[PDB]
Amino acid sequence: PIDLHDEEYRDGLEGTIAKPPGHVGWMQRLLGEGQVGPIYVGLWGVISFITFFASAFIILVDYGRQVGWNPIIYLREFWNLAVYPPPTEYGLSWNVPWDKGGAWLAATFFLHISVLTWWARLYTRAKATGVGTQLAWGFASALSLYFVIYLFHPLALGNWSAAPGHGFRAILDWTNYVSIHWGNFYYNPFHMLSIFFLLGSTLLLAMHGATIVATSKWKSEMEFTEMMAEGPGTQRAQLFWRWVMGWNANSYNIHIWAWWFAAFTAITGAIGLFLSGTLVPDWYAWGETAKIVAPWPNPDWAQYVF
Amino acid sequence: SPWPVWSGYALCFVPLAAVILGFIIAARFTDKQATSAYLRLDPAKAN
Amino acid sequence: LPNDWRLPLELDYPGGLVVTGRKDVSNHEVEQNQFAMYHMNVSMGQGCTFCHNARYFPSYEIAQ
Amino acid sequence: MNWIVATFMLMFVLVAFLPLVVSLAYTWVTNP
Amino acid sequence: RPFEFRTSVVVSTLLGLVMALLIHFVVLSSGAFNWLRA
Amino acid sequence: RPFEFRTSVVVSTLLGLVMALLIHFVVLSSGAFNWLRA
Amino acid sequence: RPFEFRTSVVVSTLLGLVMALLIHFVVLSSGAFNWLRA
Amino acid sequence: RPFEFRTSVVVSTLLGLVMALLIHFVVLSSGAFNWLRA
Amino acid sequence: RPFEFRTSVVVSTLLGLVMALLIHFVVLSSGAFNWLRA
Amino acid sequence: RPFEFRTSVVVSTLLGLVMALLIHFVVLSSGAFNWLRA
Amino acid sequence: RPFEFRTSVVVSTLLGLVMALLIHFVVLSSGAFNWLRA
Amino acid sequence: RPFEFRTSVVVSTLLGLVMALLIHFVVLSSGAFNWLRA
Amino acid sequence: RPFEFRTSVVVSTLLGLVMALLIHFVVLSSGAFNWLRA
Amino acid sequence: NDLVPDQWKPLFNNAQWLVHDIVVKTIYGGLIIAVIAHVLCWAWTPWIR
Amino acid sequence: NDLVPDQWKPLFNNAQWLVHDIVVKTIYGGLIIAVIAHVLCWAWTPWIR
Amino acid sequence: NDLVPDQWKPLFNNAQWLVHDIVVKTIYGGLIIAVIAHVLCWAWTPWIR
Amino acid sequence: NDLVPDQWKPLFNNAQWLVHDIVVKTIYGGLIIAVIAHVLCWAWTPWIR
Amino acid sequence: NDLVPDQWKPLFNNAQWLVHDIVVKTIYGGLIIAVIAHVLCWAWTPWIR
Amino acid sequence: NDLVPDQWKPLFNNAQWLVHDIVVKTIYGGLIIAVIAHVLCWAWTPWIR
Amino acid sequence: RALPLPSGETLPAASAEVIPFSIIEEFYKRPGKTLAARFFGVDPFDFWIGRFYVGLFGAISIIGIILGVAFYLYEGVVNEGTLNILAMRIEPPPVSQGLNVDPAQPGFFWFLTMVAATIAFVGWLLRQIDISLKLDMGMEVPIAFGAVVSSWITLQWLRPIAMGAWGHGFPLGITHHLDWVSNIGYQYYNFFYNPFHAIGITLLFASTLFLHMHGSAVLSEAKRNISDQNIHVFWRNILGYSIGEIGIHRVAFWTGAASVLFSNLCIFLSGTFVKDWNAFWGFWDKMPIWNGVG
Ligand code: BCL
Ligand code: BCL
Ligand code: BCL
Ligand code: BCL
Ligand code: BCL
Ligand code: BCL
Ligand code: BCL
Ligand code: BCL
Ligand SMILES: [Fe+3]
């Protein structure tokens, strides 16, 4: 019903650009399969590419203006250059001088367009091949947090200055500044839920990978074939965890667990970040009203000073 | 004065109750379906 | 720090530099604050917990 | 004193690093 | 028929739209025209 | 049966219990009733 | 079929909606019209 | 058997125990009864 | 067969467009021409 | 057969372009030629 | 059998032990009995 | 047979280019030659 | 082969190059030779 | 399959034609309303000035 | 599929011709409007000065 | 599949038609209520001013 | 591939030869223009001094 | 596969030989130019001093 | 094969031998130049003092 | 009739057959291959109480578990009297006391809790080695767990011993170890700028990404009739590379293991050799290539 060959080679707009496949070699010896092969370009594929190339061009040219078009200095201070959103004056106004904050707005707009078109590409290419569309919905879950950071949170605060600034060290600075601004960002409870889910996600990943590699000898890696008929490998993998921690899951459930942990991470993160600027101005002062701050009447500060 | 304010409950005890309940229910259901009876390959042959 | 930067001495300084939870200041003010704080850090030999108790920055418990 | 013990503890940290490398090299060898 | 016509029209209408938008943004942000309270 | 009956009773009991508990905790913490030394 | 009609209508309705939204946002934030307490 | 009896008794004894414990804790910590040096 | 013609035209128009854009940005930002309030 | 001609021309036209651009930027930023208001 | 007897005795002796320990801790830490230098 | 010739020429022309560039940069930035306004 | 010959030559030329570069940089930065305005 | 005129026969199916008619009608109505709304916001306060 | 003239027969299909016509007409109209708009924003305030 | 008129026969199934009717009726009612509500908040305090 | 001379027969195909002619001609022209441009900037202001 | 001398027959293919020749010639020319340029940079201002 | 002497036959292939020879010659030349350069850097200004 | 399947689907009618779970436990018991019995000639317990396998390593672990929980409850409930887990804090002995520990001085119970917890964790690790050894699978899970155990060892044993104060171990207690983390992060300015730190968070985010992608890939092909090359083709259409079935699990294992190792390195280093992280990057500006061009 579905021809894979006509879906691997089909000219342009409806086909792949890099028709000849290639071999990486060292990837083959350590990563399993090691062929690069063709990459499909569609209608949605060309749009995200050109919009991302526009935003990156806008940002890269504006770096050069800051250094005076000096390539020696440009290469030296590349990692601490950035472009910043408008200041608190003219908070939401769109008419700002190019050098002060005007370059940031166009770049962020083209970045948004590229992201949404990439989502559409994911969805359409998933439907075309006959497989389900779960990856697209997960990407949407991550886009929720992405859009809260850059669009929804600066809006509803009145300032475009709340968003980050398109720099390598600028993002660390943004994290630090927001946490300091709200005050004791550790106390935010949805931040606690997000950390719980993130560390659970890393836990699950390491465990699933490790057990599957250990039981590889019996061809337990092919998770699709095992779903119809469980071989000796899957039978051993269940028994190992049953004796250690008292319960276990087959090959179908464990991937549900993985998916849901990874998605809850980003959803709880977005919900928790949105509330910081609007409902609860100070998080630590809120925690002492919820009776969850350690009393610490007199600490031993000799440790912290040198 | 002795009691945690409102929104202490909503913000901190929706997580602390809901997450523990969710884990204890989801584990029951996954382990049930896993230890249930369905198609497998024989231990005496495949291994 | 940027080389053009200097310690801003045209402020009342009984608490004029405060930024926590103010809701009328954005990340630009916080950046200026952190510049001044790192300067105070390099001037003093000790570290940043010399006088702050980083759990709550507006607290005055260290007395330094 | 301080520095002898410090170097000796850094040894243990690198030893913790060690097993992962053996895993990688075993996979490289036994998968020609 | 090596060159697909539709690829040409797609890239043309994308490049034109992006270029109009970029010029419109630059001119607005330059603040040299007294347009929308300037 | 469009629905399993037991799912309905499970979700009903859970929602009712949570709702009673939340209302009882809000009313107690409001401090407007002089109940248990208030 | 070289051109699918539905792709055209999809991209048209997306571009039009985005463009209306962007213009509305820019005009509101310019503060030059005395609309919603300005 | 649509509903297993033992599930009912398990959930019943768990909910009852948790509820007794929570009420006992709240009453003790309220400090309104002069019980164990109060 | 040895050199696809369309690859040449694609890379040509991309390089030309990027180069025109870069030169116009540099000339505008140099501030030496009195163009758009300078 | 061993050495593809097109790889040579590709790397040649990339290296030459990058080198021209780098030299042009260094000479402009040195400020020793009185070119574009210097 | 609807219930394994040994599960009942296991959970019973665990709950009883935990409960005795918790009550013994709370009473000791309350400091209201003059027991072990109080 | 023990070595592919093209790997040798590739690594040779990369190392030589990098080395020329690095020496040129160091000599320019040392400021000891009075070259381009120094 | 107890040691592939090419591994030996690769590691040899890498170690030699790194060592020459490091010694050169140390000698230049020591400032004890009056070389390039010192 | 045969309701569309001959000039546009290779392009449009039969069902695709009626939808195209709805789209054209909606676009015309929207343009008329847009022009009216624009005339009204200048009679209010001009933007170019 | 022989509606296109012979000079351009190898390149254009039959359906690809009518769209090309639409594209050319739209481009001409757009250029006329662009020229008019440019004359107007120069009469308003010149940008080169 | 024969309750829908001929002009819309290739698009709509039989069941999809009655839903469409419900949707149109709901949309008309909603628009009437929306117009009334906007006349009212206007009379209260205008927002263009 | 028989248009290329015998001494370069293995290295070059027959299409690869004409493009290589174009490349050589372009490189020669570029070098001449580069030399002229360098003589001119030097007459303007010398860099080495 | 037989244009290279016997001593170097196991190493070099036929095509790999002519490139080697080009590489050697280029390296010799580059070395001559490099020597001339250093003699000139020395006569200008010595670096060791 | 069989060009390498018997004592080193189990280690070296045929092709690996000529490369080696090149490596040894290069190393000897480099050592001679290094010794000369060191004698010169010493005559200029000694570093141990 | 209907064939129950591992994914819950029931098929409308292969060496596969419906086998109840118990059968596969009795066949894979094989008692006596314990890592400990290798060294002693015998294992003391090995009797699979309930669903849990018991070994010599399991018993020392359970000792550690019970004693640690009891000491944790004794601290903060007695001698503090807060009766709220969130409010209680279990604190290490002061820095003035030094490396030596004394029953009369405070912090004695924190030390007991820490030692019991270490014993329990190591016993658990050995028990995992053991149970894997009986099944003859392989040693990957013990390695992956040993990584995080080594992180715990660095935080509570190595870094305090190198400085020598014993007060440097992070205080136990919910919502108070966060205060320690926050006071340590700011003690050395710009912990973000720390290079070994930034690699850990990079690997953490990359791990969450890999997990989401693998889960969505397997869930998408779960219940449908396809060639099994459809997922590979989809992966080649998006980003132009398909890692394979055996490849993704190796990568999961490796990234997971590497994150914690870089992290424990960064913290141990910050305590002992680097006072602040901004001064570390002072060398970059003065790299000769560009030291004078400004
Ligand atoms: C006021 C003068 C400002 C300035 C402001 C702008 C702005 C603002 C714009 C331009 C744009 C252009 N300018 Mg100007 N421009 C200035 C100075 C210059 C100078 C110079 C002196 O050197 C030059 C060479 C140009 C040259 C140009 C062209 C590159 C470009 C449009 C050419 C063309 O016709 O469009 C090519 C052909 C078309 C665009 C086809 C149009 C297609 C159809 C008609 C679009 C219809 C859209 C419709 C509304 C959508 C709904 C339709 C549905 C059917 C309902 N400008 C000064 C600084 N200039 C325009 C641009 O490129 O955007 C595209 C742009 O918006
Ligand atoms: C003093 C007045 C306080 C207030 C305090 C509370 C508190 C406190 C509670 C409510 C609850 C309710 N309130 Mg009130 N409430 C107030 C003002 C209002 C107002 C308003 C003016 O608008 C409204 C509309 C309501 C409306 C309501 C309903 C939503 C709800 C219970 C309805 C019902 O019968 O239960 C629905 C039906 C039942 C609950 C079935 C009960 C099932 C069986 C009988 C439970 C037995 C439990 C048993 C003890 C377990 C052991 C049994 C074993 C067999 C041994 N309240 C003011 C602010 N209100 C109650 C709530 O919903 O909790 C559920 C709640 O606890
Ligand atoms: C007050 C004047 C403000 C300004 C404010 C706005 C705002 C605000 C908007 C525009 C929009 C437009 N402006 Mg204006 N605009 C200004 C100055 C200009 C200038 C200039 C002087 O150069 C130009 C050229 C334009 C040109 C334009 C067009 C690009 C665009 C709409 C054209 C069209 O008809 O829509 C194309 C055709 C349509 C939109 C089809 C409509 C489709 C149907 C009718 C939509 C129905 C929606 C319905 C409510 C949904 C529910 C229906 C269900 C059935 C119930 N404006 C000044 C600055 N302008 C509008 C925009 O593009 O958004 C669309 C926009 O909202
Ligand atoms: C005012 C003088 C400024 C300066 C400002 C600029 C600017 C600004 C530009 C150049 C550009 C160029 N300059 Mg100049 N330039 C200066 C000094 C110099 C000096 C010097 C003294 O040494 C040199 C050698 C050059 C040399 C050059 C060339 C490298 C380049 C264009 C050559 C060519 O014809 O285009 C090659 C051939 C073409 C570009 C083909 C054009 C293709 C078609 C005609 C494009 C049509 C576009 C159309 C609008 C799209 C819509 C069409 C649809 C059908 C509707 N400039 C000084 C500093 N120069 C231009 C550049 O390269 O951009 C491309 C550029 O924009
Ligand atoms: C004014 C003197 C400035 C200086 C400024 C520059 C600048 C600026 C440039 C150079 C460039 C070069 N300089 Mg100089 N240069 C200086 C001092 C030196 C010194 C020194 C004293 O030691 C040296 C050795 C050099 C040496 C060189 C070469 C490395 C290089 C070009 C060589 C060649 O011909 O191009 C190799 C061959 C070619 C470039 C082939 C050209 C290909 C075709 C002709 C390109 C046509 C482009 C066309 C416009 C595109 C449109 C065409 C379409 C068909 C329409 N310069 C001083 C500091 N020098 C140029 C560079 O390399 O860029 C390439 C460069 O732009
Ligand atoms: C001094 C009074 C203190 C107080 C201090 C304590 C302490 C301390 C304890 C209790 C315990 C209990 N208290 Mg009291 N208690 C107080 C006030 C109260 C009040 C009240 C006024 O409302 C009530 C209702 C209770 C009620 C209770 C019961 C819930 C419970 C024991 C009941 C029973 O018999 O055990 C149920 C049946 C048994 C425990 C079976 C015993 C099994 C065998 C005999 C155990 C032998 C252990 C043996 C040593 C192990 C070695 C044997 C080997 C063979 C060698 N206390 C006041 C505050 N209370 C005890 C508890 O529950 O611990 C379990 C507990 O330790
Ligand atoms: C600034 C001064 C005026 C102002 C000036 C103008 C002017 C001037 C205009 C508008 C226009 C409009 N303004 Mg306004 N506007 C103002 C304040 C407001 C306020 C409010 C909060 O105060 C609102 C709600 C609006 C809302 C609107 C809409 C009525 C309309 C835009 C239509 C459009 O963009 O959609 C178009 C959306 C799309 C193109 C797609 C529509 C989607 C279809 C209908 C849904 C069916 C889809 C179908 C199922 C197929 C599915 C495909 C999917 C796309 C995938 N304005 C202020 C007061 N506004 C423009 C308008 O009326 O023209 C019609 C107009 O020209
Ligand atoms: C201002 C404060 C600084 C800060 C200061 C620190 C400090 C200080 C540290 C970290 C460390 C970590 N931080 Mg940091 N960190 C900050 C900002 C961040 C940000 C962010 C987005 O901004 C991120 C993602 C991280 C991420 C991380 C990782 C680099 C690392 C995680 C610890 C871990 O893996 O090992 C932790 C491993 C263990 C301790 C787990 C041991 C668990 C044992 C084996 C299990 C016990 C069983 C238990 C009882 C449960 C029993 C089960 C039964 C069910 C009950 N930091 C801020 C900037 N960060 C920590 C690190 O380096 O790790 C060493 C650390 O030292
Ligand atoms: Fe899996």
Author numbering:
A (entry chain M): 335 to 640
B (entry chain Z): 12 to 58
C (entry chain C): 193 to 256
D (entry chain Y): 1 to 32
E (entry chain A), F (entry chain J), G (entry chain D), H (entry chain N), I (entry chain 9), J (entry chain 7), ...: 4 to 41
N (entry chain E), O (entry chain B), P (entry chain G), Q (entry chain 8), R (entry chain 6), S (entry chain 4): 7 to 55
T (entry chain L): 6 to 18, 29 to 309
Paper text:
Roseiflexus (R.) castenholzii is a chlorosome-less filamentous anoxygenic photosynthetic bacterium. It contains only one LH, which forms an unusual RC-LH complex. The 15 LHαβ heterodimers formed an opened elliptical ring surrounding the RC, which contained L, M, and cyt c subunits; the long and short axes were 112 Å and 103 Å, respectively, and a tetraheme binding domain of cyt c protruded into the periplasmic space.
To investigate the role of Cars in the assembly of RC-LH, R. castenholzii cells were treated with Car biosynthesis inhibitor diphenylamine (DPA) to produce a dRC-LH; a 3.1 Å resolution cryo-EM structure of this complex resolved five KγC molecules bound in the interior of the LH ring (KγCint). The most obvious difference between these two structures was the absence of the entire X subunit and the cytoplasmic region of cyt c subunit (Pro6-Val16) in the dRC-LH; both were located at the LH opening of nRC-LH. The absence of subunit X and exterior KγC (KγCext) molecules in the dRC-LH produced an LH ring with exposed LHαβ interface and a larger opening than that of nRC-LH. Nevertheless, the distances between adjacent LHαs and LHβs in the dRC-LH showed average increases of 0.5 Å and 1.0 Å, respectively, compared with nRC-LH. The accelerated quinone/quinol exchange rate in dRC-LH was probably resulted from exposure of the LHαβ interface by Car depletion, and also the increased gap dimension of the LH ring. The results revealed that the Car-to-BChl energy transfer efficiency remained similar between nRC-LH (44%) and dRC-LH (46%).
